[PDB]
Amino acid sequence: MKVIFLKDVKGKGKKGEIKNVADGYANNFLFKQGLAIEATPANLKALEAQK
Template sequence: MKVLLIKDVKGLGKAGEVKEVKDGYGKNFLIGKGLALHATNEVLKKYEAQERKAKEQEALEIEEAKTLAETINSTKLTIKHKIGANGHLIGSVTNKEISEALKSQFDIELDKKHITLDKKIKTPGIFEVDCKLGHAVHATLKIDIIEE
């Protein structure tokens, strides 16, 4: 019996592979536990169509991430913050604050978890932060911290 593996099966193969197995093992274990499907022509064509659609979707997401990276790389964000008597910021600029400023000034939505600060920003000036955009695409955002 030929089966199409839906999930990785230890000792048999990885998801997406077509394997020849004994009838009892295929029907009772693999298909019964939802690890595989009976490899008919219809099932194989459906699986290939799903794979093609997933690859197209991933390519589209990568293209969107690269476009967003170009936009972020050419953007200079200005954040106003209170400054104490010693010339340092009162508190520090957080990735949440950067995310909110990006949304309000440039209408770019970027989750605060995707903004990486090497060290805390506690002084006014120009800083660069790394932004992870998914699919191994990164951007560098320039931030200008000024006195409120």
């Protein structure tokens, strides 16, 4: 699934990147720890507002 990285995650992604990752890794690690959010239209809008 496509995510937006909020923080660098070594080996996986860098803050600001939008990219595809394994679903289990997004669900159980990235989302759980606030390291990325789902790359939905709503989230991109909200994120751009908060930047």
